[PDB]
Amino acid sequence: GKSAVIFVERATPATLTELKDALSNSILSVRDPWSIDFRTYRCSIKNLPADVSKLMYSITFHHHGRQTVLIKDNSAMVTTAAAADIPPALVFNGSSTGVPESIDTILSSKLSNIWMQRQLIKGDAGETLILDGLTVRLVNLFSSTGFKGLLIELQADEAGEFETKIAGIEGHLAEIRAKEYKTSSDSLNEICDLAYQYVRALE
Amino acid sequence: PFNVDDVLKFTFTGEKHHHHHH
Amino acid sequence: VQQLSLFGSIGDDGYDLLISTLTTISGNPPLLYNSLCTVWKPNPSYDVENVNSRNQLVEPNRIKLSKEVPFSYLIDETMMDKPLNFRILESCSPWSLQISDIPAAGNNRSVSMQTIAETIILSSAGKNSSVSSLMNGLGYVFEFQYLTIGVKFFMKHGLILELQKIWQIEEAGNSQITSGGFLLKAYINVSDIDRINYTETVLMNLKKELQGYIELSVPDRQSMDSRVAHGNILI
Numbered sequence: 001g002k003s004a005v006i007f008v009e010r011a012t013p014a015t016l017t018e019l020k021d022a023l024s025n026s027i028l029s030v031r032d033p034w035s036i037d038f039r040t041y042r043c044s045i046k047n048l049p050a051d052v053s054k055l056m057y058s059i060t061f062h063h064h065g066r067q068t069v070l071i072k073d074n075s076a077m078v079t080t081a082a083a084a085d086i087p088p089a090l091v092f093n094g095s096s097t098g099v100p101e102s103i104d105t106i107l108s109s110k111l112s113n114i115w116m117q118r119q120l121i122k123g124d125a126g127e128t129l130i131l132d133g134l135t136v137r138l139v140n141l142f143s144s145t146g147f148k149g150l151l152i153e154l155q156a157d158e159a160g161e162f163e164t165k166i167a168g169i170e171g172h173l174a175e176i177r178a179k180e181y182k183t184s185s186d187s188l189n190e191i192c193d194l195a196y197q198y199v200r201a202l203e
Numbered sequence: 204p205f206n207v208d209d210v211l212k213f214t215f216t217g218e219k220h221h222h223h224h225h
Numbered sequence: 226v227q228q229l230s231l232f233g234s235i236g237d238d239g240y241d242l243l244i245s246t247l248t249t250i251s252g253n254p255p256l257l258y259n260s261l262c263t264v265w266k267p268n269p270s271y272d273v274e275n276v277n278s279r280n281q282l283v284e285p286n287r288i289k290l291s292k293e294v295p296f297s298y299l300i301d302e303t304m305m306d307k308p309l310n311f312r313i314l315e316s317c318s319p320w321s322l323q324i325s326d327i328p329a330a331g332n333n334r335s336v337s338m339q340t341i342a343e344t345i346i347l348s349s350a351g352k353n354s355s356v357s358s359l360m361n362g363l364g365y366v367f368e369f370q371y372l373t374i375g376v377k378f379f380m381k382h383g384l385i386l387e388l389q390k391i392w393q394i395e396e397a398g399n400s401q402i403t404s405g406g407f408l409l410k411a412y413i414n415v416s417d418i419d420r421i422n423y424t425e426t427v428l429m430n431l432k433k434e435l436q437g438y439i440e441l442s443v444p445d446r447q448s449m450d451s452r453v454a455h456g457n458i459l460i
Contacts, residue, residue, distance in 0.1 A: 045271040045364055056362070067347075072362050075351030079322075079344050086345055087319045093258040094377070094387065095291035096321040096343065097414050099226040103322075103344045110324045110342055113275050113283035114267065114364050189316065192350040204236040204406035208448040210391065211232070213402050215325075215451040216287070217264060217369035219393070224460050 001155070002162045004185035005197035006169065007141075008150035008178050015150045015178060016127075016138050022172035023129060023136070031128040034137060035062035036151075038121040038198060039104060044114055056115065057203070058104055059195040068103050069195035076192040079103040121148055121202070133158040134165045150178075151201075153194075226341045229424050230412035231432055231441035237406050239439075240388075246438065247378050247386060255376030255388070261302065262291040263370040265360050266453050273364075287451040288365055289323045290346075290356065294372075303372060303394050317356040320346040327450035336428050337443045338421075370394050371402065382427045383413050411441055 008015055039058035048054055056072040065085055070077040080086075081102040090096040107115050126139030137153035154169060156162055166185060173181060184200035187193045213219060235243050248254050265288045267273075275283050294302050301312050326340040349359060357367065375389030387410045391402040411431055413424045432441045 043364070044273045045268075046273065047271050070359075073352065075349065075353050075358065075362065077317075077349050077359050078347040080347055081344060085347070089293045090291075090319065090321055090345075092256075093260045093293040094385075095260045095262075095293055096345065097226045097228065097323070097341055099414060099416050100321075100343045100345050101226075106322070106324060106342050106344055110286060111283075111363070112277050113285070114273055116278040188351040189348055192348075204234050205403060207232050207234055207408065207442075208445045210402050210408050211444050212448040213393070214262070214371060214391065215449055217393075219400075219402070220459070222459070 001157060001190045002159060002185075003156070003190070003194045003197060004154040004162075004166050004183065005194070005201045006152035006154070006166075006173070006181060006183045007201040008152070008173070008181045010180045011150045011178060013140055013147055015176065016140055018176040019150070019152075019172060019178065020127070020129070020138065022175050023131065026131050027129055028132070029130045031130060034064070034126040034128055034139065036060065036123040036126065036139065036198075037062075037104075038123075038141070038202060039117060040119040041107065041115045042118045044116060055203075057195075057199045058107070059198050060102070060104065061191070061195075064191070067191065069191060070103060071195055071199050074188060074196075076188055076195060078189070078191055081105075119143065123151060126153075133161070136169065151198075155194075226343065227415040227421070228339045228341055228412055229336045229415060229421070229428060230339070230410060231336055231428050232411075232444050233409035233435075233439050233441045235388075235406050235409065235439060239406065243388065243407075243409075243439065244376070246435075247388075250434065251378045251380045251386070253378060255378060257374075257376055259293060259296065259299070259372065259374045260291050261294050261370065261372050261394075262289055264289050264368050264451070265365040266368045268361070268364055268366045271364055285453040286324050287368065287453060288360070288363075289325070289451070290320045290360070291323065292318060292320045299372075303392075303399055306394075307396055316354050317346065317349040317359065319348070320356060322346055325449075325451055327452065328446045330446065334443050336425050337446075337449065339449060372399065375407070380431075382424075384411065384427050384431060385413070386411050386431075409439065409441070 037060035041056045043054040060068040066082045067080045081100050086096050091098050121141045121143050123139035123141045129136045135155045139151050141148045141151050182201050184197040186200050188196050267285050323343045329338040372392045373389050378386040388407045392399040
């Protein structure tokens, strides 16, 4: 699998649709809407060894497992708050209580002195557009301060032709007059790079 | 056999007693 | 999650009788199981204030990582753990991450009641992907770890009974915390007041049903508190 995240900094709630139509003649079908939470935590340790970030990102995918990936210093940790995702063996030997919660809840309620939530960007009612061997997800990101931008999630099973697929979408962005945007297809396990890409495109 | 509380206390904090307490 | 429980114990010689009793009482023979737990504490080299962004007091606590270990790998992960390439047989394995609170206060409690915050670690990637590095990234360090082996029984209403043996693990050697016998634990995990009073009843009926033979009681709250604190000389 492969992926890329495009974040349109300069944009408005409408930009989503404008790009949605530039694909009207490339679309095939539309699957269920998706959601996503993007959190930023700042470390409160004051002796922090030089060149160790003080920043940690938390990317929560909704029904991509209700999973949350933690990213810090180019490293990622995949977690889940879904009892249904618990490895059977951990439930059997008692390692798990069978009733997990979010790593974010733990961070804010048990480790809040060490980690403070700085920002919380949410993307609701996203759209899953299905093209030719390229799935394109679109969602408007909002902060506690109103609109924050447009986010494009590009997932493609086709390991081959991809660099072309990404360039194509960036083109339709030029058409809708969407200039000054950031694109990431970097890498560090799918869910991890995807999470990483959001970070690169938003940080 | 052993002291339940002491065994538990170890699993929660890691302390082993070389002396008898209380 | 709320874990309601009661504990007890028996010496090695009481094993067979207890197994026979629990097998008849529950209807099923025992099920063998194990788990490795590694406990971590805030890095002492780093120091942070103990307060919120809202300036509210936060108490430092230990984080517990737990998972099962195939029995075939048991010697390798305990005795022969060090010299990495000295053995009999990339990313991190799945783990259960837990932070617990000291049990609920109250004189004459019929059971112990403990709140447990848990999340599941599924995998990792990147530079420092080892669970150890990840814990460090959170600002924690390895403190201690123990292995527990035992048999469990599934009973009605979600009641579970564990007969366990515990071994602390260190290069200097594993020492059996339960040397002499088994730690007996009966508990139910509760995700409404009703279901809480109902769960208490289930535990109370089990206690009642074993009265005379083996006694189950509420352990001392202070013995179930993982908060970090000092360098206190006991008594």
